[PDB]
């Protein structure tokens, strides 16, 4: 009856104003330059201006990387995919592509000059399902969470939670936008079909509650004016969180519960300044708590609960940028002070030594999780990480994270009774 | 004609420069009262000494320096010493808290409160400067606003400026004088920071300017001004190139030349042994032969090494006092024939050497002899990266456990920059590992 | 000339405060009337981080008398040293307010905290700078273990960018027995394990151990058992108010001996032993003196550091001295022991040396020695709150105010947590 958190990947698809950049150097290089070559014959290696005008006519306005290869001229940064994911199929990837470029080529055997950068870094990473960056939401959905709700109504409970750094797209992969919907969304429409398809044999009822916790405090966005001194966290003398003055709300049509969750997110603060206004700067955790009845009304009864979790988790965020200091970092670094309690827990549990403490008693998102990680509950993670080479040591950490957390030991046996 | 700038970061910046600045006034006659006796007939111009200094309507000879520190107690003890009227009333003086021994306070919190006034009054200097040469920063590795403020006003500065030759002098750390646990933690962050917009850092370890003030020197626990001034009498011997243009003078720009292979493994060790007592100094006089000879032993270096295992990159002798040329090829000869030094497998070039015509000064009631034929070294090596593997250790036993981890975080940095940084480190040394490698 | 406000609530918080600010005028050569007089010009180095300038060289203290019930105030001032706090210092209400911790925290505390928080604005408004605010209050009785929380608990969300330092005097059965203690106390802890970095665990066992044991007074009076807390947090407190090398601002004492912001627990000691008054005694020697800190006599905290192991040791010494007397023995010190200094901690002991002694006493020394032996403190009131706790008595005292017994099992499982937490670490090696 051993269980085991499984693990799930999602790549950005480029945004515009990258995806030019992306288009005007990268290509030429992939197709015929880097990938291909040519003869002994090449009267011009890479300094061609055939890419859209990227030189001007006469010498180079920019010191170049290597042999002419990018950095033609004067701008931000060079911000092109000379280090990148690699998704080649659905059950592996490798990261720090081997043999992009002939500056690697050459490297090798030479003196060990810019050497072991590479080589060391020849790993591969075997995670249970991969994603492309052409899927849509029905495509995650088709894989990441329908065996999970099939095991929520039999009585099992069950959790989700994002992850990675900001401009992953977390808040569209799971809270959806005002057309493109999200995770929740689909879950709830399935549920209330599977609740038609079974009703007159077993009666079932649904309940809601949304929490936030910005700076390290607890609120709720389907009742404001609570003020947050109020809320605290306590527990009873049987291993539960039960959090005081919750609202609690019960739904009972598709439209009232979809406009009251919209009328809850759009409590939440988030940066209104650059045009990343979805920046959402605070956590998020949604539950889903089903009841059955049954309808026989002879032996066989199976009276059984189940819950499922849905967790928005904001971003790490680094000094890259991030101007008026003091306030945008102070609501960076409650979140980063959290995301290290997390990661602490997460490298505490994973080892066979250090198990006899596993401390959750930490900033509040770690004891909020306690049922998640080593409770009864299934887990399934989504990590959005980012493949431009603009953002690559957080997609090196967020990765040796996604592996990290992937051994993990939970017994289920389900809420059944009589 | 090539005026550096000094910039001192910190309180060890600010102490070490105290000490320097104090005895160049006194080694070019210039009065702690600005004035000084050849500029009644010179007045001023473009002389290898007005490198530094400068002119006014007064001929009071202002140095070119601004004082960074962020707390005000060490910066008011230097408006409160004896060079007032020296330094003009524009030292940055601060009016609020300190990094207080955490690089992340240093570096985003706190640091850009001031940082844009401290480009003002660098721009103020720089601009007076028809040849701006190069940047002299001085800051420490373990400290708090040394750490950060540093890595940060060398980016600033660099992307303001563009391509400047810029040099640092380091304070590596030791556990005999550690005001601190969490030295470690800024000093491979700091490095981590340096390494990629720093053309020459210089390590004066602590621990050993100890040891040698405790052996050479009797003294038995010597506070911080022994050790300052030990250490100023390095940074002379090393600055001492650029202040006067006679025969044999090899610039201080040129050592650069043949210091820097690639821009990753530009920390040399430096010696230094005219060092001895002042009532212990008679009765002898040191010849070239051996004061050459000297600088070799492992005793005399400043970085806890054994170049005797290892191998020599390169190495670079300048002399001072009155030395003649005669000697020192004899010497050079008779050094050539030690067998224990080894050089790199793709490199003989041998000994560059440099002789500057002028006696090295010691402050009135110090305690180092006037010992005129004072050498000095610069040679890399590959022992220098045991130093970084010291370090490494203590970040494997200190990082298992993630403690102090949060004071870091909590300012502002995630977690990922640690592992970055040690990873760098990591680079660092396997780098010096594999180019001792053989040539076949 | 980074400032500290100094609020004190309770009437054991207010005596300590009393004995304590008494003492720093001394050594710092000020005495009531507000004037200067002493014996080196040391003194004035650093004033303003705890004193303030006012008009006529007056130095009056800034500092908050926290106190309901009236009495005190008319026993401080009349006091020895309490005839020169401002007018406005005080705030206080008109009832005693009792034992019962919810009258305090809840009904009660709501009344005059507003005041108390408006008068520390006030003190903030004046000054330049403030590193971080310290108590003093004792987990006893409801008036300080109720407001000095609520204070915490407020002035934390008011000025977050500071490190909170509290004088805890944790009471033991021997000093009081009074059986709702170990429930106020349980639950007065885990509301400072969050909103605090920076604790001394000051216990009344071993304060009473030592008045009986090595010193041989047999009815120890509150005017002796005060003699020790006062001195050990002046010899705590001796770095800020002088010039020195070593921690002159709390958030180097945090960064120094915090490893995690849960595990903020130390055990100060005491290496001579003074009764009150004129009494002197020989000589100290610094090997006897420092072989004399280590061993667990002199130990303010009932827990035997012998069973369990250190973190950090960071040592002050006071008076003249040469300056490599004490670094011969204390490294050999640090050599003999094989096993009892955690290894994967780099460079564990620190030390510091001051000039201007103690009054009376040339030679002493202090140390704020974090360990993780402490845990015999918690898992002893542990045993003092199971066992009431299992038959769930006394409850109707507290749970007839607001609270609820939700409450007290999250103490129970906090306490809990914390003692397997410090344990975890007493094996887990490099
Ligand atoms: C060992 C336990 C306590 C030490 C003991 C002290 C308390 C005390 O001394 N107290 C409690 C307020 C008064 C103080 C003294 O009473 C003697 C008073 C004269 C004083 O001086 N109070 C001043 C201190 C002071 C001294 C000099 C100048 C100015 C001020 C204070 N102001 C404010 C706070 S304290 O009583 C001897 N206590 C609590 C007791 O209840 C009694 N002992 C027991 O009950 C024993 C236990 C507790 C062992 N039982 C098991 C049977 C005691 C009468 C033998
Ligand atoms: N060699 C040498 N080292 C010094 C001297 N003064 C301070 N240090 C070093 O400086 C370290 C202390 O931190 P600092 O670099 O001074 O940091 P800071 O300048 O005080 O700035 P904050 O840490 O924010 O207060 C110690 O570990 C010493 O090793 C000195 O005079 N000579
Ligand atoms: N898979 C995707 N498909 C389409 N657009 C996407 C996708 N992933 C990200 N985006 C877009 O990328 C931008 C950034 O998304 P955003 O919701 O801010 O990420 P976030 O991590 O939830 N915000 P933050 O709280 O700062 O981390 C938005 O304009 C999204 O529409
Ligand atoms: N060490 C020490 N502890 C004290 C002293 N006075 C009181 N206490 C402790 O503090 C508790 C009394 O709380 P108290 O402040 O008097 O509550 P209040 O009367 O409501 O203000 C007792 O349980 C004692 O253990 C003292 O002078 N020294
Ligand atoms: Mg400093």
């Known amino acids: 009856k051993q269980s085991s958190i499984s693990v799930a990947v999602r790549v950005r698809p480029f945004t515009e104003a990258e995806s030019n950049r992306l288009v005007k150097i990268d290509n030429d290089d992939v197709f015929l330059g880097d990938g291909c070559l040519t003869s002994d014959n090449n009267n011009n290696n890479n300094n061609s201006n055939s890419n859209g005008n990227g030189n001007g006519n006469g010498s180079s306005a920019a010191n170049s990387s290597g042999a002419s290869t990018s950095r033609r001229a004067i701008f931000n940064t060079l911000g092109g995919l000379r280090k990148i994911i690699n998704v080649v199929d659905d059950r592996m990837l490798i990261f720090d592509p081997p043999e992009t470029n002939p500056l690697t080529k050459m490297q090798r055997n030479a003196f060990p000059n810019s050497f072991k950068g590479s080589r060391i870094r020849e790993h591969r990473f075997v995670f249970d399902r991969l994603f492309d960056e052409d899927c849509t939401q029905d495509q995650v959905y088709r894989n990441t969470t329908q065996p999970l709700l099939d095991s929520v109504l039999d009585g099992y409970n069950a959790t989700v939670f994002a992850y990675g750094a900001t401009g992953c797209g977390k808040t569209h992969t799971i809270s959806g936008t005002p057309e493109d919907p999200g995770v929740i969304f689909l879950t709830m429409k399935e549920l209330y079909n599977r609740i038609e398809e079974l009703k007159d044999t077993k009666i079932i009822d649904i309940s809601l509650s949304y929490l936030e916790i910005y700076n390290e405090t607890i609120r709720d966005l389907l009742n404001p004016m609570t003020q947050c001194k109020n809320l605290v966290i306590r527990e009873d003398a049987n291993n539960k969180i039960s959090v005081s003055n919750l609202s609690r709300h019960r739904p009972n049509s598709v439209e009232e519960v979809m406009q009251l969750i919209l009328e809850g997110n759009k409590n939440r603060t988030c940066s209104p300044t650059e045009a990343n206004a979805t920046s959402s700067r605070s956590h998020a955790v949604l539950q889903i708590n089903v009841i059955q009845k049954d309808r026989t009304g002879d032996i066989t009864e199976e009276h059984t609960f189940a819950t499922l979790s849905i967790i928005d988790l904001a971003g790490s965020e680094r000094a890259a940028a991030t101007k008026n200091r003091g306030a945008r970092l102070n609501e960076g670094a409650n979140i980063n002070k959290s995301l290290l309690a997390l990661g602490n827990c997460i490298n505490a549990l994973c080892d066979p030594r250090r198990r006899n403490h596993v401390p959750y008693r930490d900033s509040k998102l770690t004891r909020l999780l306690k049922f998640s990680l080593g409770g009864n509950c299934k887990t399934v993670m989504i990590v959005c990480v980012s493949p431009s080479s603009q953002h690559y040591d957080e997609t090196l950490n967020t990765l040796k994270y996604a592996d990290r957390a992937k051994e993990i030991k939970t017994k289920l046996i389900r809420n059944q009774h009589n | ?440 | 000339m980074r400032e500290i406000v100094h609020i004190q609530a309770g009437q054991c918080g207010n005596q300590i405060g009393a004995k304590f600010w008494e003492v720093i005028s001394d050594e710092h050569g000020i005495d009531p009337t507000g004037s200067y007089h002493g014996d080196s010009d040391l003194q004035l180095e650093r004033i303003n981080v705890y004193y303030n300038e006012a008009t006529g060289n007056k130095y009056v203290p800034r500092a908050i008398l926290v106190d309901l019930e009236p009495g005190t105030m008319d026993s401080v001032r009349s006091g020895p040293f309490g005839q020169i706090f401002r007018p406005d210092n005080f705030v206080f209400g008109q009832s005693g307010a009792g034992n019962n911790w919810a009258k305090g925290h809840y009904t009660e505390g709501a009344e005059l905290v507003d005041s108390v928080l408006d008068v520390v604005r006030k003190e903030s408004e004046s000054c330049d700078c403030l590193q971080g605010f310290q108590l003093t209050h004792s987990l006893g009785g409801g008036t300080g273990s109720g407001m000095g929380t609520l204070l915490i608990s407020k002035i934390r969300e008011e000025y977050p960018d500071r490190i909170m330092n509290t004088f805890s005097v944790m009471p033991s059965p021997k000093v009081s027995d009074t059986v709702v203690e170990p429930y106020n106390a349980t639950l007065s802890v885990h509301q400072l394990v969050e909103n605090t970095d920076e604790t001394y665990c000051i216990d009344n066992e071993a304060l009473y151990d030592i008045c009986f044991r090595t010193l041989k007074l047999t009815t120890p009076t509150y005017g002796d058992l005060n003699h020790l807390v006062s001195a050990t947090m002046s010899g705590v407190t001796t770095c800020l108010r002088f010039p020195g090398q070593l921690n002159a601002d709390l958030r180097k004492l945090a960064v120094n001996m915090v490893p995690f912001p849960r595990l903020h627990f130390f055990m100060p000691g005491f290496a001579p032993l003074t009764s009150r008054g004129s009494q002197q005694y020989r000589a100290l020697t610094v090997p006897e003196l420092t072989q004399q800190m280590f061993d667990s006599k002199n130990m303010m905290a009932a827990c035997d550091p012998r069973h369990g192991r250190y973190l950090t040791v960071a040592a002050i010494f006071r008076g003249r001295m040469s300056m490599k007397e004490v670094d011969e023995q204390m490294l050999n010190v640090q050599n003999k022991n094989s096993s009892y200094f955690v290894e994967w901690i780099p460079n564990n002991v620190k030390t510091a040396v001051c000039d201007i002694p103690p009054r009376g006493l040339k030679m002493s020394a202090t140390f704020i020695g974090n360990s993780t032996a402490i845990q015999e403190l918690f898992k002893r009131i542990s045993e003092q709150f199971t066992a009431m706790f299992r038959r769930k008595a006394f409850l109707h005292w507290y749970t007839g105010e607001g609270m609820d017994e939700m409450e007290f099992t999250e103490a129970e499982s906090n306490m809990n947590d914390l003692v397997s937490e410090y344990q975890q670490y007493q094996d887990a090696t490099a």
């Open chain 2, 1 to 440: 004609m090539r005026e550096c700038i000094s910039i001192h970061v910190g309180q060890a910046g600010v102490q070490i420069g105290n000490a320097c600045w104090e005895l160049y006034c006194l080694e070019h006659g210039i009065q702690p009262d600005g004035q000084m006796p050849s500029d009644k007939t010179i007045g001023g111009g473009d002389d290898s000494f007005n490198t530094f200094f400068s002119e006014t309507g007064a001929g009071k000879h202002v140095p070119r320096a601004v004082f960074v520190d962020l707390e005000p107690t060490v910066i008011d003890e230097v408006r409160t010493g004896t060079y007032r009227q020296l330094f003009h009333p524009e030292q940055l003086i601060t009016g609020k808290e300190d990094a207080a021994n955490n690089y992340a306070r240093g570096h985003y919190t706190i640091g850009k409160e001031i940082i844009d006034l401290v480009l003002d009054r660098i721009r103020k200097l720089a601009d007076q400067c028809t040849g701006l040469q190069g940047f002299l920063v001085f800051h420490s590795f373990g400290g708090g606003t040394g750490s950060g403020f540093t890595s940060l006003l060398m980016e600033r500065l660099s992307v303001d400026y563009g391509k400047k030759s810029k040099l640092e002098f380091s304070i590596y750390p030791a556990p005999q004088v550690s005001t601190a646990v969490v030295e470690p933690y800024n000093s491979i962050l700091t490095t981590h920071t340096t390494l990629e917009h720093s053309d020459c850092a210089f390590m004066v370890d602590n621990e050993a300017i100890y040891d040698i003030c405790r052996r050479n020197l009797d003294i038995e626990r010597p506070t911080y001004t022994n050790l300052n001034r030990l250490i100023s009498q390095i940074v002379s011997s090393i600055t001492a190139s650029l202040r006067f243009d006679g025969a044999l003078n090899v610039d201080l720009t040129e050592f650069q030349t043949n210091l820097v292979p690639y821009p990753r493994i530009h920390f040399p060790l430096a010696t230094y042994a005219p060092v001895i007592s002042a009532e212990k100094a008679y009765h002898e006089q040191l010849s070239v032969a051996e004061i050459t000879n000297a600088c070799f032993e492992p005793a005399n270096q400043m970085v806890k090494c054994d170049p005797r295992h290892g191998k020599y990159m390169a190495c670079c002798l300048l002399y001072r006092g009155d030395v003649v040329p005669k000697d020192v090829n004899a010497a050079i000869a008779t050094i050539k024939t030690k067998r224990s030094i080894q050089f790199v497998d793709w490199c003989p070039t041998g000994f560059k050497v440099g002789i500057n015509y002028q006696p090295p000064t010691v402050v009135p009631g110090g305690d180092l002899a006037k010992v005129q034929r004072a050498v000095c070294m610069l040679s890399n090596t590959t022992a220098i990266a045991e130093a970084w593997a010291r370090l490494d250790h203590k970040f494997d036993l200190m990082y298992a456990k993630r403690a102090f981890v949060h004071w870091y975080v909590g300012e502002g940095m995630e977690e990922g920059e640690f592992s970055e940084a040690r990873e760098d480190m990591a680079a660092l040394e396997k780098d010096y590992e594999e180019v001792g490698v053989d040539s076949v």
